[PDB]
């Protein structure tokens, strides 16, 4: 039997440096985790011990910290090249800076193949990008070969900025003929590496004949066999076994997100490329693993430009930005309005004739707003200033919520009003009126929302059975601040852009801001 060790990462999201346990800024170095210098140590150890190793990434290196803001993917090519990745699939966030921001910094500079079988280009773009990403690559591994076939979320156009010259095909439709072709070329060991989420990964394992292993991402899915090593709760066993339509057992793996874990799967193959066995587990990259000194020194050299950028003017405010708890946990606050307006601006994506934009609505817990910004520093706003407002290292995510769910969220917003608690919601594209004289759970007396399926945006009453797209912090999507109804009732969740980065981009675009308090939230 021929044994292959698959090492894999996904959704690293710009965590070049080691992190806290929750993947935010490292504060207590002795308890920090992940980062590329530590990953290097572990990958190097494994490659000393195991003859046949592939190191794969299932996409979404782009977006997540100031590294991406400043280096715009140059850091991804540089550090993934230093770690000698063997292949990467395109994720949705690889399109955040458009096609041009993918071609240059990543596709031209990577020393490994970049894969996606389900993305096609037309017009001049097709000639410009031809061969810079591939449907698959056949890689030599010892005396054998392994085909790796890529895929990317069909939903990328709603979740990034790929432009109108790329088409994202159904994954299974695109993958089957490539896997078929590899069979005709005597490639009997096939890994599907891609970025569509655990649910699609299981359908691929089930339906794509000839796929031996699925290495996925996008859904930040933690899988584990045994007692978990940290705070992440497993969604299932590692690997997750799918029984394929042709009767095979196909392992499906993912490795959470943020470079906290290294995925590690050992596969035994027979001489015909059938999987005989698969086992493994992600490896927690905790402080017991040293950071590689050479990689760490290069990280610290690249950090200089980050420190320089963090104090540069992004733009100006002519108004006090009231991020005080005394405002933002009690009433509409102009910092809340600014951040929600930045969230909606970030989620402007290419529109059908069926909507002016796919999403119009925003909610933001006032407890997530951690500082005001004073306008009397000649109006300057810096990244450092925004990092005081938004210090948790979160994202602004896209969810789909029934109106009934959102009305329950707005009741939760004021259920214990008057105690300076974090759950009070700031808004965009929503007008709410509370009557605090009513019983908790019955305080919302008007709730109007900005239409999407309309040529002129206007407000209509919220409908209980309608499903709304809403931009909100990951903290709330995950049921933080007691918003269990959001976690338990949401119909869709996709992780979005770094919180600070969303606001910094909007302020840079606007150049001079003057957000008002304007009656998005009223009390009767």
Ligand X SMILES: Nc1nc2c(ncn2[C@@H]2O[C@H](COP(=O)(O)O)[C@@H](O)[C@H]2O)c(=O)[nH]1
Q: Which stretch binds its own copies (CB under 8 A): 85-93, 448-456, 465-473, 498-506?
A: 448-456
Q: Select from 147, 217, 273, 496 the one that contacts Ca ion (CB under 5 A).
A: 273
Report whether 218 belongs to an annotated binding site.
yes
Q: Which is nearer to its own copies, 143 or 353 (CB)?
A: 353
Q: Which is nearer to its own copies, 77 or 361 (CB)?
A: 361
Residue 460 interacting with its own copies (CB under 8 A): no
Calculate the CA 70 to chain-centre distance: 18
Residue 122 interacting with its own copies (CB under 8 A): no
Q: Which residues of 427-458 are buried (b: 16+ CB within 10 A; e: fewer)?
A: bbbbbbbbeeeeeeeebbeebebbebeeeeee
Residue 14 interacting with Zn ion (CB under 5 A): no
Residue 319 interacting with its own copies (CB under 8 A): yes
Question: Minimal distance in Å, beta carbon 394 to ligand X?
Answer: 5
- # residues near Zn ion by CB under 5 A: 6
Q: Which is nearer to Ca ion, 5 or 405 (CB)?
A: 5
Distance CA 312, CA 290 (A): 33
7: which strand partners?
Answer: 55, 264
Long-range contacts of 449-453 (CB under 8 A, 24+ apart): 449/360, 449/361, 450/360, 450/361, 451/360, 452/355, 452/356, 452/357, 452/358, 452/359, 452/360, 453/354, 453/355
Question: Minimal distance in Å, beta carbon 221 to Zn ion?
Answer: 11
Question: Minimal distance in Å, beta carbon 469 to its own copies?
Answer: 15
Residues numbered 54 to 83 that lie near Zn ion (CB under 5 A) are 60
Q: Are 13 and 257 in contact (CB under 8 A)?
A: yes
Which of its own copies, Ca ion, Zn ion, none interacts with 423 (beta carbon under 5 to 8 A by kind)? none
Report whether 329 belongs to an annotated binding site.
yes
Residue 91 interacting with Zn ion (CB under 5 A): yes
Q: Select from 102, 192, 242, 450 the one that contacts its own copies (CB under 8 A).
A: 450
Q: Binding marks (x or -) toward Zn ion, 488..507, rule CB under 5 A?
A: -------x------------
Residue 511 interacting with its own copies (CB under 8 A): yes
* Residue 304: burial class (beta carbons within 10 Å; 0-12, 13-18, 19+): exposed
Q: Select from 305, 446, 514, 524 the one that contacts its own copies (CB under 8 A).
A: 514
Which of ligand X, its own copies, Zn ion, none interacts with 514 (beta carbon under 5 to 8 A by kind)? its own copies
Distance CA 439, CA 262 (A): 50
Q: Select from 185, 351, 436, 491 the one that contacts its own copies (CB under 8 A).
A: 351
Residue 212 interacting with Ca ion (CB under 5 A): yes
Size of the chain in residues: 524
* Residue 288: burial class (beta carbons within 10 Å; 0-12, 13-18, 19+): exposed
The residues near 147 (Cβ < 8 Å, ≥ 6 apart) are 136, 137, 138, 139, 179, 182, 187, 189, 190, 191
The residues near 104 (Cβ < 8 Å, ≥ 6 apart) are none
Using DSSP's 3-state secondary structure scheme, residue 398 falls into: strand
Distance CA 87, CA 56 (A): 5
Which of its own copies, Zn ion, Ca ion, none interacts with 337 (beta carbon under 5 to 8 A by kind)? none
- # residues near Ca ion by CB under 5 A: 3
Dihedral angle, C-alpha 181, 185, 187, 192, nearest 10 °:
-20
Distance CA 237, CA 223 (A): 5
Which of Ca ion, Zn ion, its own copies, none interacts with 11 (beta carbon under 5 to 8 A by kind)? Zn ion
Q: Which is nearer to its own copies, 297 or 514 (CB)?
A: 514
The residues near 127 (Cβ < 8 Å, ≥ 6 apart) are none
**Residues forming the site for ligand X (CB under 6 A):** 365, 367-368, 392, 394, 422, 473, 475, 481
Q: Which is nearer to its own copies, 233 or 456 (CB)?
A: 456
Helix (H) / strand (E) containing 73: none
Q: Binding marks (x or -) toward its own copies, 263..282, rule CB under 8 A?
A: --------------------
User: What is the phi/psi pair of residue 347, to 5°?
Assistant: -105, 20
Residue 354 interacting with its own copies (CB under 8 A): no
Q: Which is nearer to Ca ion, 174 or 208 (CB)?
A: 208
The residues near 227 (Cβ < 8 Å, ≥ 6 apart) are none
Helix (H) / strand (E) containing 102: helix 100-102
Strand order in the sheet with 425-428: 425-428, 361-365, 467-473, 395-402, 492-498
Enumerate binding residues for its own copies (CB under 8 A): 318-320, 322, 334, 348, 351, 353, 356-357, 375-376, 431, 450, 455-459, 509, 511-512, 514-519
| Binding residues for Zn ion (CB under 5 A) | 11, 60, 91-92, 218, 495
- Give the residue ranges of the annotated binding site for IMP: 329, 365, 370, 392, 475, 481
Write out the binding residues.
11, 13, 60, 92, 195, 218, 329, 365, 370, 392, 475, 481
Per the annotation, binding residues for AMP are 329, 365, 370, 392, 475, 481
Binding positions for Ca ion, rule: CB under 5 A: 188, 212, 273
């Amino acid at each position: 039997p021929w044994e292959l060790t698959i090492l894999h990462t996904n959704d690293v999201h710009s965590r070049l440096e080691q992190t806290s346990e929750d993947s935010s800024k490292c504060v207590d170095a002795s308890r920090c985790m992940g980062g590329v210098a530590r990953l290097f140590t572990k990958v190097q150890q494994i490659r000393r011990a195991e003859p046949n190793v592939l190191l794969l990434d299932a996409g979404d290196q782009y977006q997540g910290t100031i590294w991406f803001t400043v280096y715009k993917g140059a850091e991804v090519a540089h550090f993934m090249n230093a770690l000698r990745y063997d292949a990467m699939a395109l994720g949705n966030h690889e399109f955040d800076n458009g096609v041009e921001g993918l071609i240059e910094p990543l596709l031209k500079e990577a020393k490994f193949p970049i894969l996606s079988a389900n993305i096609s280009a037309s017009g001049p773009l097709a000639s410009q990008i031809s061969g810079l990403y591939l449907p698959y690559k056949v890689l030599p591994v010892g005396d054998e070969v392994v085909g790796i076939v890529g895929y990317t979320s069909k939903e990328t156009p709603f979740l990034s900025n790929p432009g109108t010259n790329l088409v994202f095909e159904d994954e299974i439709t695109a993958l089957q003929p490539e896997v078929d072709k590899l069979k005709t070329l005597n490639v009997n060991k096939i890994i599907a590496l891609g970025h569509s989420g655990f649910e699609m990964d299981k359908l691929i394992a089930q339906k794509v004949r000839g796929v031996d292993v699925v290495v996925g991402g996008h859904s930040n899915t933690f899988l584990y066999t045994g007692n978990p090593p940290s705070k992440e709760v497993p969604a299932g066993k590692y690997p997750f076994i799918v029984t394929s339509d042709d009767g095979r057992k196909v392992p499906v793996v993912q490795a959470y997100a943020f470079g906290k874990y290294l995925g590690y799967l050992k596969i035994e193959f027979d001489e015909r490329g059938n999987v005989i066995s698969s086992h493994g587990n992600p490896i927690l990259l905790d402080s017991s693993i040293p950071e590689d000194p050479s990689i760490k020194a290069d990280i610290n050299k690249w950090r200089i430009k980050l420190d320089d950028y963090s104090t540069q003017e992004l733009g100006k405010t002519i108004v006090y930005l009231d991020g005080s708890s005394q405002s933002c946990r009690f009433r509409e606050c102009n910092m809340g309005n600014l951040i929600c307006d930045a969230m909606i601006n970030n989620n402007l994506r290419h529109a059908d004739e069926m909507f002016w934009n796919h999403v119009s609505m925003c909610i933001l817990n006032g407890g997530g707003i951690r500082s005001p910004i004073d306008e009397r520093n000649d109006g300057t706003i810096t990244w450092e200033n925004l990092a005081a407002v938004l210090p948790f290292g979160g994202t602004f995510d896209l969810v789909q919520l029934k109106g009934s769910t959102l009305k329950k969220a707005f009741e939760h917003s004021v259920h214990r009003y008057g105690q300076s608690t974090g759950e009070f919601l700031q808004v965009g594209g929503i007008h709410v009126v509370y009557d605090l004289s009513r019983k908790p759970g019955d305080r919302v007396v008007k709730l109007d929302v900005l239409c999407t399926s309309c040529r002129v945006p206007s407000y209509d009453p919220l409908k209980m059975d309608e499903v709304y797209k809403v931009i909100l912090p990951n903290f709330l999507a995950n049921g933080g601040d007691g918003f269990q109804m959001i976690k338990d009732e949401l119909l869709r969740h996709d992780s979005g852009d770094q919180d600070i980065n969303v606001v910094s981009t909007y302020i840079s675009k606007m150049k001079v801001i003057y957000p008002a308090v304007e009656g998005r939230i009223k009390f009767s």
